[PDB]
Symmetry: C2
Subunit: 285 residues, 2 copies
């Protein structure tokens, strides 16, 4: 029976570590890290994302600043705001909620963020630095998965790692995290022939396709580490991963549950990135 990678617990540890570090900064008379969140429009989904970031900031003692701009906001005005935030010494992280209005160049706006304040980690500069073995702020979900492996003392060097899905948000940066971690790294995707052959050889399997039960559990290599990034809402209200858990758990040495596995690490790593930006790049001692 596989050991559980308890992402809820690990995420809470990470957030507690950030919170205690902010405490120490406070005690030393230093400013708390600051996060700026920019929104354009009032889509209910996006509203939730502000709440979740203000919530995560309040939890660890950060400053947070929310800009709710009207739909009339022009691209020029938004780029001016990003310029202002890039120059604000009290702001360590800048987030821009998507989607933006159809007439705004998403890419120009997001790339205007200074990389050392891109706590989401998807500025091409940051992805490229990770690719070049010299990471700065890193994509949150792949970096959170690396933290999971570290916190369970799982040695990554030499492992045959297989990523299922080559998404920009997970699959692709995950492969560069895995390479930095010493894994032999295979990226599979929709055009991959005979996935089962790849899965059967994987010491470490990261599945990120967003398709419930895409990987049957009897494909899992005996002793493998299984990281399931899927969060698939089913008819009956159940939430389930991309890997069929029951059969995978009979074979893996470690497995992430869904929910409570990779999910919580994403937000915790955002908070971790924001402290890093503050401590390492903006207000170093």
């Amino acid at each position: 029976a596989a050991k559980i990678i308890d992402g809820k617990t690990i995420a809470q540890q990470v957030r507690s570590e950030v919170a205690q570090k902010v405490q120490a900064r406070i005690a030393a008379g230093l400013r708390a890290p600051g996060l700026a969140v920019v929104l354009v429009g009032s889509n209910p989904a996006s509203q939730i994302y502000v709440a979740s970031k203000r919530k995560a900031c309040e939890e660890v003692g950060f400053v947070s600043r929310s800009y709710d701009l009207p739909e009339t906001t022009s691209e020029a005005e938004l780029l001016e705001l990003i310029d202002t935030l890039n120059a604000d010494n009290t702001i360590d992280g800048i987030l821009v909620q998507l989607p933006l209005p159809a007439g705004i160049d998403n890419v120009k706006v997001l790339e205007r963020i200074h990389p050392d304040k891109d706590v989401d980690g998807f500025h091409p500069y940051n992805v490229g630095r990770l690719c070049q073995r010299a990471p700065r702020l890193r994509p949150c979900t792949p970096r959170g998965i690396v933290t999971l492996l570290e916190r369970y003392n799982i040695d990554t060097f030499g492992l045959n790692a297989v990523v299922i899905g080559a998404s920009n948000i997970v699959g692709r940066p995950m492969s560069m995290e895995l390479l930095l971690a010493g894994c032999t790294t295979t990226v599979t995707h929709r055009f991959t022939k005979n996935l089962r052959h790849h899965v059967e050889n994987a010491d470490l399997l990261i599945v990120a396709v967003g398709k419930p039960g895409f990987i049957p559990g009897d494909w899992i290599k005996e002793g493998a580490i299984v990281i399931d990034v899927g969060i698939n809402r089913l008819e009956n209200g159940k939430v389930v991963g991309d890997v069929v858990f029951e059969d995978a758990a009979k074979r893996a040495s470690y497995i992430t549950p869904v929910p409570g596995g990779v999910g919580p690490m994403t937000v915790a790593t955002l908070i971790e990135n924001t402290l890093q930006a503050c401590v390492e790049y903006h207000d170093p001692q």
Copy 2:
């Protein structure tokens, strides 16, 4: 068996002639030729050989080149000011900095000071990250030249099981992202890989970039594999051999790049391509 040759020397000549034709057409339309800037700090004939192979390689296609030779004593601040000047020079489409730079100069800070749209080598992290996330701009030269070889030989890449041997920043890592962009299942191996041969034996497409003569025996090649050999290994002998044992790999591969005359000339042809692209798309469109 008798693998077909991937004739990089001939493909590179096609690329260079295609560029020279577009340069001529620009001149006939009253438009400037593309411009290359090369920065040299010091005097060792490490620099001085490679630079010359560009002073006229880019001239063979009709580029204008200019080479700055700064004294070994140049400060990092002066070097950064020079890059600032070249970034602002509209007649300059590509900037090349000769490495190594003198000890005491932050090489990364100098190279990253180059505007990505003039980074015709493709090694700026912004450019690497853009490639990683499926929105490539200027691409790393050796992997892009390899993709050109596959395209010019009408090699279908979608669904191929591709294996990259070596994970260097200059080849292996960007190569995996080019092959993912081209629809290959991609595996990157390196010094920590267990059972390299097992990965190699299942490779439809093999990119060997380890810089060791005859490191890959023909025995390991999957029957019908496409074999790309990035090695340029000079023996105590004079002249060059690749990372793959050509004589034995040719018995089993369907296609194989010889050394010399395979990947080598394509790396230079792709830089030429990148400089024209920077001129035509980014600077003087």
